[PDB]
Amino acid sequence: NDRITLPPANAQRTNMTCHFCIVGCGYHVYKWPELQEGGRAPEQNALGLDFRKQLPPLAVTLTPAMTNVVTEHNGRRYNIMVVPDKACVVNSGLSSTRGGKMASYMYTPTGDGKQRLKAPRLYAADQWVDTTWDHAMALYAGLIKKTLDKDGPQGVFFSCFDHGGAGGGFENTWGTGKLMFSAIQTPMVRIHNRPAYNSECHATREMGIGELNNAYEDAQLADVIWSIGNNPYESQTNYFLNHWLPNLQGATTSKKKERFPNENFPQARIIFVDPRETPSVAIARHVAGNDRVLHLAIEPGTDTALFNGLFTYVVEQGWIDKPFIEAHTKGFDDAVKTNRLSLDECSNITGVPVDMLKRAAEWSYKPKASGQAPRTMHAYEKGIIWGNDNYVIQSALLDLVIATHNVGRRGTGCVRMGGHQEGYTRPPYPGDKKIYIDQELIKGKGRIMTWWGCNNFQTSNNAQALREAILQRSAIVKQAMQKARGATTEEMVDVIYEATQNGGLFVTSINLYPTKLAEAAHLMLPAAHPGEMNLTSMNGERRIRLSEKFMDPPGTAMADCLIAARIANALRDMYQKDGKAEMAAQFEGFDWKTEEDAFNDGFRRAGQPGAPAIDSQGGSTGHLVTYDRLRKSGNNGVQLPVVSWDESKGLVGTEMLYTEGKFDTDDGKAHFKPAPWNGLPATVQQQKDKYRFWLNNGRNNEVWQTAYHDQYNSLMQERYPMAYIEMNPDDCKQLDVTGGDIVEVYNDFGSTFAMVYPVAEIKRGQTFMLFGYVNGIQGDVTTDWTDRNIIPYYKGTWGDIRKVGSMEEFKRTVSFKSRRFA
Amino acid sequence: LRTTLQYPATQVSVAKNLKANEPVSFTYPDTSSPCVAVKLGSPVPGGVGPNNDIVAYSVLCTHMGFPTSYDKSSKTFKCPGHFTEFDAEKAGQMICGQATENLPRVLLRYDEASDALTAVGVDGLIYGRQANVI
Amino acid sequence: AGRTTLQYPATQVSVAKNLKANEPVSFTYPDTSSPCVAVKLGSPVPGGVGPNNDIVAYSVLCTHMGFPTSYDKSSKTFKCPGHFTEFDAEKAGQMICGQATENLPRVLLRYDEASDALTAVGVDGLIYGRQANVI
Numbered sequence A: 001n002d003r004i005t006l007p008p009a010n011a012q013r014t015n016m017t018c019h020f021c022i023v024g025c026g027y028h029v030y031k032w033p034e035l036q037e038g039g040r041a042p043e044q045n046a047l048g049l050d051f052r053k054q055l056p057p058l059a060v061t062l063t064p065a066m067t068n069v070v071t072e073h074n075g076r077r078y079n080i081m082v083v084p085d086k087a088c089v090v091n092s093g094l095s096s097t098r099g100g101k102m103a104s105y106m107y108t109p110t111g112d113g114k115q116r117l118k119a120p121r122l123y124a125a126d127q128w129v130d131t132t133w134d135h136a137m138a139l140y141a142g143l144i145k146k147t148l149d150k151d152g153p154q155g156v157f158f159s160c161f162d163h164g165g166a167g168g169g170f171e172n173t174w175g176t177g178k179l180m181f182s183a184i185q186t187p188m189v190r191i192h193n194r195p196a197y198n199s200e201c202h203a204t205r206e207m208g209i210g211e212l213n214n215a216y217e218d219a220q221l222a223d224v225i226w227s228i229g230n231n232p233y234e235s236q237t238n239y240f241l242n243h244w245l246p247n248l249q250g251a252t253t254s255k256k257k258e259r260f261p262n263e264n265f266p267q268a269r270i271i272f273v274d275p276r277e278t279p280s281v282a283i284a285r286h287v288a289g290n291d292r293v294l295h296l297a298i299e300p301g302t303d304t305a306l307f308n309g310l311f312t313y314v315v316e317q318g319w320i321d322k323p324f325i326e327a328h329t330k331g332f333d334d335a336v337k338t339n340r341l342s343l344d345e346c347s348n349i350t351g352v353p354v355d356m357l358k359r360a361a362e363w364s365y366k367p368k369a370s371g372q373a374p375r376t377m378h379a380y381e382k383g384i385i386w387g388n389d390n391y392v393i394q395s396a397l398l399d400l401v402i403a404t405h406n407v408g409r410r411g412t413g414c415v416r417m418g419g420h421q422e423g424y425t426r427p428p429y430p431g432d433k434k435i436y437i438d439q440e441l442i443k444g445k446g447r448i449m450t451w452w453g454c455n456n457f458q459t460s461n462n463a464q465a466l467r468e469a470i471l472q473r474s475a476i477v478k479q480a481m482q483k484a485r486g487a488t489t490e491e492m493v494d495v496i497y498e499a500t501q502n503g504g505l506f507v508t509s510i511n512l513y514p515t516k517l518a519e520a521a522h523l524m525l526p527a528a529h530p531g532e533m534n535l536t537s538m539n540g541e542r543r544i545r546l547s548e549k550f551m552d553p554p555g556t557a558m559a560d561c562l563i564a565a566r567i568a569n570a571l572r573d574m575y576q577k578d579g580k581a582e583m584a585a586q587f588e589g590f591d592w593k594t595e596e597d598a599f600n601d602g603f604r605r606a607g608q609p610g611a612p613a614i615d616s617q618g619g620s621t622g623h624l625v626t627y628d629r630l631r632k633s634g635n636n637g638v639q640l641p642v643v644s645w646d647e648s649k650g651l652v653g654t655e656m657l658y659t660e661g662k663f664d665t666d667d668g669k670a671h672f673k674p675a676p677w678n679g680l681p682a683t684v685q686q687q688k689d690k691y692r693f694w695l696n697n698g699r700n701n702e703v704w705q706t707a708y709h710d711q712y713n714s715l716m717q718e719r720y721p722m723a724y725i726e727m728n729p730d731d732c733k734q735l736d737v738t739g740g741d742i743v744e745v746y747n748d749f750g751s752t753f754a755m756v757y758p759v760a761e762i763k764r765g766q767t768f769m770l771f772g773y774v775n776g777i778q779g780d781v782t783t784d785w786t787d788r789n790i791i792p793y794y795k796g797t798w799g800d801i802r803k804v805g806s807m808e809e810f811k812r813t814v815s816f817k818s819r820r821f822a
Numbered sequence B: 001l002r003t004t005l006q007y008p009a010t011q012v013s014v015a016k017n018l019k020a021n022e023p024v025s026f027t028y029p030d031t032s033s034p035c036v037a038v039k040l041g042s043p044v045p046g047g048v049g050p051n052n053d054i055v056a057y058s059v060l061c062t063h064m065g066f067p068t069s070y071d072k073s074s075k076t077f078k079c080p081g082h083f084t085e086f087d088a089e090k091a092g093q094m095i096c097g098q099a100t101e102n103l104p105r106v107l108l109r110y111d112e113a114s115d116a117l118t119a120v121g122v123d124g125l126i127y128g129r130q131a132n133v134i
Numbered sequence C: 001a002g003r004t005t006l007q008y009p010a011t012q013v014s015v016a017k018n019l020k021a022n023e024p025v026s027f028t029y030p031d032t033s034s035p036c037v038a039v040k041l042g043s044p045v046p047g048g049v050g051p052n053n054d055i056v057a058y059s060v061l062c063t064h065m066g067f068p069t070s071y072d073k074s075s076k077t078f079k080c081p082g083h084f085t086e087f088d089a090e091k092a093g094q095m096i097c098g099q100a101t102e103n104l105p106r107v108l109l110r111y112d113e114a115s116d117a118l119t120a121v122g123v124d125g126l127i128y129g130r131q132a133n134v135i
């Protein structure tokens, strides 16, 4: 509708980091009784804005989607307004479409959050019902205990978030990790986005370069930005908007010159390595001109060849830092030999013309006239992380970066752009092997599987094999449960345990919402998100912020760290009752009343005297951070690691990593690695050999992840009622499809469905499907293939397309117009 | 008492003066609110006039308020600020962008007797306003 | 206008310590045609005010068809003689059984520790027989 209730001048104001992407944009949450409002005069409302007359452009970001009315546990009603902080350095008052919806996605009884989990849910053999928390713990802890006593920890499976922000963060990763690893001590654990306990960044870390090694200010200071496997307007909006674009526009030139009096700073340029022409390519060309953008539209999976050709060329031209290499690196001469690739071979493999390869090197590595190498920030994400051999691509890319001294200089960095926020503090993983968890589950292993803060039915690789197996195993438990009548909780535990000896699996989901996991889950436990709890996390430049609690969770929904404590204390109590003092002792250390307690126990204990082994993004100075100190810091927080604290200075942190040439390896040097080109994996190549289309996949600007909130939003559902597939118009004509037709996409791995979205910029025999979605799951057609560390090539699959027919309704209501701005 | 805003009734033009896909500019509901009406040339849900094809919008981007520009070739409104684009053929649906609200529709009465188009209301909240009527 | 909110009056009811457990006090809010009751329940409830968080207040007009309901001290409910709707004073006017489609409206009380005063400051829910709570 057509009006908004303004926040009163004296309204309560708390800090809130965005729930969603890595950028970690700062917001303020205004909270006030429903029957009060602000006046239009700027000094009579909390915004300080003059609503007596039209506001100019950029004065505010404020829509009805940024407002709500919450009903608290006391039954009292409060207006809320969730709006970007103008003085936050991250976003400077910018809000993406995703963060802009936070108010709407706060829990209310009648709004978009109406189907929030509010109590334990139990599938009692043949129907969903509520149950109590104590019954849920008796069943869940009971099973875990039984499994520990009979099978050991290897019978207990998890797939759990390791990330930051909403459904993650330092309190939550500690809580879950302490439970899984210190208490239960299970190695049968995967991560939300990948099917083993591993890293996205094995190669770069082992080369001595952690993947978040710079500041967002570095994107302002760069001569050149590379965006490799990365659609940052859509996936990291406000980093792109607030930092990248001002550089491309010339707004940061005078700051470069002030820092470096004796260095030329040409107009900044941008290079995209992406098989696909994305909105980010289009918008870059709009802002900077076609002459300052290079789209290296590589063949899918050919990143390694690209970087080996560039590395070879910059070495042959001598566009490298030989003093840097000599003082601070190891293995260069070996990498020159193993990685040798001519520009002609590079061009044949990539499909990129030799002139474009040479130009990219010239922009990026050839000394400027003043003598200094260009400041080239190399930013990468899932196009290579989920690319053709995660480990080898990073090896090849980092070799280029290290040889060109593009780490440790301002305006440089070889960095992840990131996904979620970060907020990792955990004990070490208690196994000595990587385990492909999905494969284990498919093969019939484990008694109990918990999805915690994730939904692999929508997001696993080879997701169809996964769903099939889980549904069937779930059904066996359902069938066994239904023969019970009048059983105690203990008897039920035995019935379910027995069913798991005959192929069954007990499935638990700890979540905000039922999700598609409800098709298989036997138990669902209600969690709480930021604003319903305090939560700490850091963004892509390691900036740690506290998100303040300002409202109650729905019903008995709890902070994930506190659910973990609940589980630990239930297990402890069972062991104490069973007279097993040693097993009880493993479940000590969860005497937690609030999320802060998890912060004190994890983040703040890392590297302290008498602490156990803790792997924390805070490092050993994490104890200097407190909730009260973060509050005083505001949405600016501090860049980790913290270097000092006092009352007069606040938290003082770290802008850029590796500025003195000391890397995270045994000898302090960065290590070059061999990067062989072996083509595509045979599993993926077999799909490519049999089927017509490359089934690229990934993000839409407007849709967040598995659409857990978005599925309930009427605007989102009207815009994207179904997952879409970008198709070349000529391919469309060949298949007799147009916008709003439905197609089956299929291969040897699976079958799924999408609505057709003709896109002129898509190449013939290539496609692009929205990933993770609630209607048409893309991942059914991804292969089982992973690299050496069990990293999937999610961006590597091929399949055929078959027309189902025309969805008239989609044609009447959905725009199929171009999403590439020109 | 009253639950609704007091919108003015503002004459825009007569429908038959509008040429297909040639935007007309006007202000509604006051001189600080720029709007466009366009004859699309083809009926759309809720279009007015003889061919049910005339639509009208607030042109201020619902992100951060830059005046958008009507593109005749795509029949969209594009924002130069952060690249939001709205579909004039789907009631302001955001095609791609950073807004959380569709482009507000100016509600037109079409009187057959006079051929008049009158702006009588707005569906959606105009950028940078506490209420559509200040 | 601007304004999206009704202009509720601030009306003194009494000081909290004058209220006896389960002995309803009558007052009118937000005008003399809107009969209301405040009662100390004797035990805390969500959103109760006063020293023992137990004082609640309501419109007594049935939200079905508007008959003045009567407070039953033995059940702590409001009962309507019209079509036998009954509302729970301890569950924010939840309808126990009846023909209404709306909970009994709550009179929002400010409690000031400094003065011991209870002031009616608003209504949560719509009073029967009114376009808006404030006429």
Ligand SMILES: Nc1nc2c(c(=O)[nH]1)N[C@H]1C(S)=C(S)[C@@H](COP(=O)(O)OP(=O)(O)OC[C@H]3O[C@@H](n4cnc5c(=O)[nH]c(N)nc54)[C@H](O)[C@@H]3O)O[C@H]1N2
Pocket: A166, A167, A168, A192, A193, A382, A386, A419, A420, A452, A453, A454, A455, A456, A458, A459, A460, A461, A510, A511, A512, A513, A515, A527, A528, A529, A530, A560, A697, A698, A704, A705, A706, A707, A708, A709, A771, A772, A778, A779, A782, A794, A795
């Ligand atoms: N084909 C294909 N597959 C992919 C990818 C790809 O590019 N291609 N990308 C991968 C990537 S990068 C990722 S990150 C994964 C994402 O895979 P998932 O992690 O499965 O998906 P998300 O939507 O992040 O899951 C978040 C879930 O947690 C719930 N949730 C939200 N807040 C909370 C909270 O506070 N607590 C709890 N307990 N639950 C909460 C949500 O409702 C939702 O069910 O998908 C991966 N899968």
Ligand SMILES: Nc1nc2c(c(=O)[nH]1)N[C@H]1C(S)=C(S)[C@@H](COP(=O)(O)OP(=O)(O)OC[C@H]3O[C@@H](n4cnc5c(=O)[nH]c(N)nc54)[C@H](O)[C@@H]3O)O[C@H]1N2
Pocket: A021, A022, A098, A228, A229, A230, A231, A232, A234, A235, A236, A273, A274, A275, A276, A278, A299, A300, A301, A302, A303, A381, A382, A383, A384, A387, A388, A417, A418, A419, A420, A696, A697, A698, A699, A700, A701, A702, A703, A704, A705, A706, A795, A796
């Ligand atoms: N709007 C929105 N933003 C998000 C998310 C979201 O769901 N919605 N999710 C967040 C998360 S968890 C993550 S992980 C990030 C994802 O951020 P990105 O990785 O930026 O997003 P994607 O769409 O998965 O993929 C990036 C690009 O990889 C390209 N690509 C495909 N195959 C190849 C290949 O072989 N090589 C190369 N070089 N490129 C290839 C695709 O064409 C695509 O444009 O986004 C985060 N931000």
Ligand code: F3S
Pocket: A018, A019, A020, A021, A022, A023, A024, A025, A091, A094, A095, A096, A098, A099, A100, A236, A237, A238, A239
């Ligand atoms: S608003 Fe949120 S979605 Fe990312 S761009 Fe900013 S953190």
Ligand code: FES
Pocket: B061, B062, B063, B064, B065, B066, B079, B080, B081, B082, B083, B084, B097, B098, B099
């Ligand atoms: S102001 Fe229009 S897209 Fe941001």
Ligand code: FES
Pocket: C062, C063, C064, C065, C066, C067, C080, C081, C082, C083, C084, C085, C098, C099, C100
């Ligand atoms: S008038 Fe009260 S129950 Fe009908």
Ligand SMILES: [Mo+4]
Pocket: A193, A419, A420
């Ligand atoms: Mo991710």
Ligand code: NA
Pocket: A464, A750, A751, A752, A780
């Ligand atoms: Na399928």
